[PDB]
Symmetry: D2
Subunit: 424 residues, 4 copies
């Protein structure tokens, strides 16, 4: 394949959305339709048997199919033409009975989405497993939290990972919830009412849905693209979180920080570009919801292009995030070094709390604040400046004071918050 | 307030996102926080009573708050400063205890979203009610379905409305599902671990959630923006369907079509522009999910701008669609006139089927197909061309053939599909 | 190659952005670099001769290049490695001298853009030629102008085409203007300062620019992506106009309108989807301008994905519009029929003016206004309602009033406006 | 005003796009139209004098105007109504003569864009001036360049600033080029052909353009939105560069880097959010180019909302970037400290070059590479490891060797590249 096809895509996701799997879905739908309609007495029983026997992607002439599609303008009837020609005894004229091409394309797209989300669920399960392990392994490793890219107060690396873990669990819930809407048959014919099937239209629809393990539709949805668009916005939300992970890991991999390492942050690079492309594709799928009347004049076709791209981009981002988290290098010594840069300023709030009991909470804040900025101007440890304050030094000895100035003693309830995420 | 403020926004939704309601939310949070911490014994109970007494938006100096916000850079501490100054006996120094400003903004944004979605749910119930009425009222009103802006086969106007109705019901389900994730407290302090509250952080968080009728958070989510972004993508999905409705109504009110009328399609005009703005805002909120570390350096602030805009645009789109659907003018005579334009071509498939027993399946298809092409090129009724087929004219009188060429006799199961959207 | 590859892309544009042309550009750059540095005395002249001799894309092992690119992470050094191995006597070790991989990718992307814009300019010249012919051919063909999808006043079809023509001429000017910025060499090395070339960096850069027929760069632009992004926004602007053309043509070919025909509006369908995808890609390229420091950690790679996609989508949109405009079917009789739909209401303003001298300015307005409303509600010709105004019928015979109610007599200066777009 | 109105907007840009300035533009256009048409003999000379005297924004009833606009649906005729009522002797009936409301809104928008770009040009001039000073002041200050957020080789801070300077100069060229297209009159009447003005339509148009200091239009452009959309894409490109500047400054302001300081990087925070909102707004303006027929049914109205927002967001981003660059704090000692982190590895390429003359260039690379990774594993200076190599140590003494290991001696032609940018 192409040089970059497996860098911004993956083999597995490329296969699902390939021409071969797409047509294979078409053929399974035509097969299930023939079987259903024979059982209902709509078409003769030979014909179903002969049609099903020729619903094999290996018999397709791809070059002719491309020609016919460019020249019909839509991608299904070129396959129906070869199916009729490969059946004997004129029995092929009973295939595609009452269908329109968008019944086949919509339902095939549903089938490909289900295959795609199987891969996504597996990657998510693996990512969640890695984050559960990392939150526990590094539960007590202290590090500087950062607000506006400036050090704030200490936290633990496990706490950081538990926050990603909780987010991906919410994405897992979103996925399961949309599946019950998305895994739905589309079978409505030219205008949605299956007019050519008369009083057998709904009966055919419901039987076909059961054959394909899909929910029956309430009504036709050929220009009602909320199911596909919702898949796209979910991909946007998920890669949004993947892009945050890539951002934080690449920030922690700067030469001047050195707190983690990928197993150059190339995986983070690919995640970032993939997420950027997916979010704009989501806007395009929202745009496509403007499909006019009973078959959209353009909007529908946006989905043909964007959905396979977005799925491929997302699988590549998921692949890279899974790989990084599963072999992530963590460097507690660099984390400790960065905690010590401010020479105590990062835990001034811990000094205020300890001294608040003897001097008053508000007064302790103001007193320690003055010591902080004094320590900043002179580039000296806060401990040295605190000890030069009789009001402070008369109420806390050195042993207590370097304890309060030790960044590793101001972790708050990080461990209990981690337990709250791990327990469910 | 402004010339266009109630055209691309609404009074109710503008009030929700105004500075006054935003700060009013801030004060309710600070009040509830003081009460909770007084109950836990963290601050004196008389201090809480004085703080709560001064948690009134009418006491705020707006110009001073504006100035301080521009100097500080963030919108909460200007309000905490006035609360501290307005309380007696220095008791205001116990407010905002252990909080960071993004605890207040995130939780206030949650409360404003709940208020917004109450309005959205009301609009949705009303739109759904109108469409149920329209689907039943016009259940049997025939019209031409349109594919690629060309007439396809006949349907009924009620069928068309039932297809919108089924979609809005899916949007209602999406709304309910995201509410359980979105209606969640944010109280985590500077780095998420509430370090300044020691062993009282989790207790304070959970009690505050109950006081505000919000779910307790698993863990802090200051840079985990999936709850806000998912609100944005839902607004994108909903306004996508609103934009289709606007498209189909303005197409049906073209001078050359005239099948419906607004109660110039000016409401459809506003809906179109609102949806376009909302879909791009959703991409920006997905972009904002890239918030670094424990407080984002820029991405977070995207949400401050986009969320009130998208809420306002969405409420204006909903208002116009609600208004249009409640007084929609329907013109069945124009509908019938347009059905008669093709002079039978629109039901050629019904003619093929009706003739299959008399002519043979193959000839019926081929004869009607060729006769259709003649009638189109010559601009004559299909019936007249069929009668000039001696084989056809020898077996079917004009009366029987006239029934097959009548578009009102080829509606399929439109009524039963309507029942499927309504009756369950 | 793929079923849809020539429907949402084109053979010529796919070739330009293929791996083979991309690498072929790489080799031409390495060849020109060796020659320049041999001329400057940096590398031996026999080494350059051997490098140039092996700068042939036919000698590349594509599967190995694919593997190495996936291991290295970037797409150039896999080609430099095979060039070094294919040269004799270790003379290949003088290639890529002082270059970084983004020098090769940026400059190759520039060359591929120049090839792409050659195709774009050809399509633009052909579209402009077709519109000049259509504006002149149909200069006097009357039709209804439409505002908010409602008939407004009469215009001519040539006037409508002259308005598209004027727009594409503005797009041609934008194209020419950006070419002088975009056709620029990138050769700056790892950090932009060509440190490894010492006092020969600028000399090498400027000589290489001449060898490739590119402008010398002011300074390195590895993270300064305005040249590539401006190509993307231009494609957005151009496909925006193409999307309007597709909209107006598919509206005029509605069954109820029938004023034009494609030579189903299938080309308009593809144009619509291509433009929607291109406009979102432009936002992604603007996003990519956020490239950090001297080599971007993610944003840069957005360009690798989006630019070939947008180029391909744009070429397919241009191909379809070029094809449609060159064989557009125009139906003046349908145009006249639609002009006659309102039975005179569309030229009520001409009636007011014609009557002003006879009735007085004020009464002419008021009388014609009220008569219009009667004719609309009663679905009768305006002329008949005017004649039932005794004051009007006493001063103007039917013949004079019939001329004022004739839409073909109220065309204004359509022809002179056409001359303004054509004659200059 | 609102709490955040001057944080994500500016006073000056809010004024330009306010209701008051918008209507003031409307009134000037109606005044110029009256004067022009009196000179042409189209309307009587009193009337022009009386109309002009009442073209004053102070006489407008804003509450009535809001009511009429919501209820007409478009924003001009409410102003024409008050103008007619404020003129004596029925002379107001000659205003707005032959105009449609979009002539007034389009032309007013052009006038507001010209006012807006005056502010943008001033900010750009000030930013370019700051960057010229910084490139010269810090021409020789060494620092680490960074690729993929990892240290690459040394450059100077002045070199970094010269790269921004060259980019903003290209943005200045883009601005000047679009001005000649954008500063154009829109005066075409209901359908673009000014039918109600007969053979005086073009004459009125050209005279009005001269009166307003605007270019005459080739033809009407009511649904041809490339001029407005092009303003939006330029804003996207410019804020793209502003967002890169904010990114690099906030990265250099991390606690662990400390190389620059703003005069928390709050200005960088606002720039980032503003740029993110502008890029999506650009996609919406591209979307709006799909305006149907002679007056768009929705797309046109997108521009009413997005353009003032994008202008305001851009002015706030420009304001912050201007302020930061004009008082930027630069810390060469921190820059030198970060250059020394790798203990010589960052200038290993300088050692390869110096040693290449005695050992051969290729062999020198391989030899120094081995010393580099040895130095990395043992966390020792490259100099110490190099001196432990007889082949290397026999050809370069220590004095030469710590010179080559000194990061401040490997700047390449940074100074000459700066001169190349400053010289024009």
């Amino acid at each position: 394949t192409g040089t970059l096809s497996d860098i911004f895509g993956t083999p597995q996701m490329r296969e699902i959305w390939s021409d071969q799997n797409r047509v294979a879905c078409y053929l399974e739908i035509e097969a299930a339709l023939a079987i259903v309609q024979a059982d209902l007495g709509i078409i003769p029983k030979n014909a179903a048997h002969e049609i099903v026997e020729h619903c094999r992607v290996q018999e397709i002439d791809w070059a002719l199919y491309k020609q016919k599609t460019e020249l019909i303008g839509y991608p299904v009837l070129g396959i129906v033409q070869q199916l009729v020609a490969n059946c004997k005894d004129g029995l092929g004229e009973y295939c595609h009975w009452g269908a329109t091409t968008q019944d086949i394309t919509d339902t095939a797209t549903v089938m490909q989405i289900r295959q795609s989300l199987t891969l996504v669920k597996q990657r998510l399960d693996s990512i969640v497993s890695s984050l559960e392990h990392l939150a526990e392994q590094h539960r007590n490793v202290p590090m500087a939290a950062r607000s506006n890219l400036k050090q704030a107060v200490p936290i633990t690396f496990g706490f950081k990972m538990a926050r990603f873990l909780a987010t991906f669990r919410r994405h897992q819930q979103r996925l399961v919830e949309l599946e019950k809407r998305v895994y739905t048959l589309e079978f409505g014919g030219a205008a949605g009412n299956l007019s050519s099937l008369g009083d057998q239209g709904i009966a055919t629809h419901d039987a076909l849905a059961k054959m394909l393990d899909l929910a029956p539709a309430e009504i036709a949805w050929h220009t009602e693209h909320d199911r596909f668009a919702e898949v796209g916005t979910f991909l946007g939300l998920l890669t949004g979180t993947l892009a945050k992970l890539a951002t934080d890991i690449k920030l922690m991999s700067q030469t001047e920080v050195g707190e983690v390492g990928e197993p150059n942050p190339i995986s983070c690079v690919y995640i970032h570009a993939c997420a950027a492309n997916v979010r704009q594709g989501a806007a395009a799928l929202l745009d496509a919801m403007q499909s006019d009347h009973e078959r959209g004049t353009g909007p529908w076709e946006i989905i043909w292009v964007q959905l396979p791209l977005m799925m491929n981009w997302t699988s590549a981002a998921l692949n890279n995030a899974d790989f990084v988290l599963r072999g992530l290098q963590v460097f507690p010594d660099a984390m400790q070094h960065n905690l010590d840069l401010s020479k105590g300023l990062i835990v001034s709030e811990a000094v205020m709390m300890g001294l608040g009991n003897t001097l008053g909470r508000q007064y302790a804040h103001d007193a320690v604040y003055e010591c902080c900025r004094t320590a900043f101007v002179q580039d000296r440890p806060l401990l040295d400046v605190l000890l030069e304050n009789h009001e402070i030094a008369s109420k806390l000895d050195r042993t207590e004071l370097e304890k309060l100035c030790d960044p590793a003693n101001y972790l708050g309830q990080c461990s209990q918050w981690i337990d709250r995420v791990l327990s469910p």
